[PDB]
Design a protein around this ligand. Sequence first.
Ligand SMILES: *[C@@H]1O[C@H](CO)[C@@H](O[C@@H]2O[C@H](CO)[C@@H](O[C@@H]3O[C@H](CO)[C@@H](O)[C@H](O)[C@@H]3O)[C@H](O)[C@H]2NC(C)=O)[C@H](O)[C@H]1NC(C)=O
Ligand SMILES: *[C@@H]1O[C@H](CO)[C@@H](O[C@@H]2O[C@H](CO)[C@@H](O)[C@H](O)[C@H]2NC(C)=O)[C@H](O)[C@H]1NC(C)=O
Ligand SMILES: *[C@@H]1O[C@H](CO)[C@@H](O)[C@H](O)[C@H]1NC(C)=O
Ligand SMILES: *[C@@H]1O[C@H](CO)[C@@H](O)[C@H](O)[C@H]1NC(C)=O
Lengths: 49, 35, 35
Amino acid sequence: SGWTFGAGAALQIPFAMQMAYRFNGIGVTQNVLYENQKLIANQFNSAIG
Amino acid sequence: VVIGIVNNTVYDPLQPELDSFKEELDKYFKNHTSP
Amino acid sequence: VVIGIVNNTVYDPLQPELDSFKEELDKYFKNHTSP
Ligand SMILES: *[C@@H]1O[C@H](CO)[C@@H](O[C@@H]2O[C@H](CO)[C@@H](O[C@@H]3O[C@H](CO)[C@@H](O)[C@H](O)[C@@H]3O)[C@H](O)[C@H]2NC(C)=O)[C@H](O)[C@H]1NC(C)=O
Ligand SMILES: *[C@@H]1O[C@H](CO)[C@@H](O[C@@H]2O[C@H](CO)[C@@H](O)[C@H](O)[C@H]2NC(C)=O)[C@H](O)[C@H]1NC(C)=O
Ligand SMILES: *[C@@H]1O[C@H](CO)[C@@H](O)[C@H](O)[C@H]1NC(C)=O
Ligand SMILES: *[C@@H]1O[C@H](CO)[C@@H](O)[C@H](O)[C@H]1NC(C)=O
């Protein structure tokens, strides 16, 4: 549900799309995530290990 | 490269601004081409 | 529906970027239909 479950009813949203909103808050456009989704995912799975 | 993209069409805001103008130009063109 | 709305003319730059060309496009047609 992203971050909308703390201010009312929880609304679902695909995870690959939710992160595109978090980038949009940083200051980078969302097109940098979709064009690098595979690289970013491989860069996040390794980090948690 | 974008995973899961879908198919549709995007309407140019100028498209009605030219479909009613270039055709208007075309209608003006038709106003002199036929005779 | 909105309370307190008022009248005025919304100057749309889309028009001078065509009207000035309408001053040129129709001028071409006027220069084209006159002879
Ligand atoms: C969205 O629409 C576009 C077309 O506007 C679709 O692209 C087209 O996809 C087909 C796949 O069946 C391509 O056919 C392929 O042709 C090659 C020869 O070039 C052949 O070797 C393949 O076996 C296949 O038959 C077609 O070429 C392609 N259109 C263009 C202009 O390349 C696209 O698939 C649509 N997307 C969705 C999600 O429906
Ligand atoms: C804003 O402009 C509109 C459009 O002309 C005005 O609505 C008309 O006002 C006249 C009076 O001047 C009436 O006779 C018409 O019946 C109105 N038309 C409609 C569809 O209601 C409106 O009065 C103007 N308002 C202001 C504050 O200038
Ligand atoms: C066609 O041109 C004439 C002048 O050459 C003009 O009077 C007429 O209005 C034009 N037709 C249209 C549909 O505007
Ligand atoms: C009108 O057209 C003629 C040729 O058809 C051209 O020489 C002339 O410069 C044109 N006039 C204007 C004001 O564009």
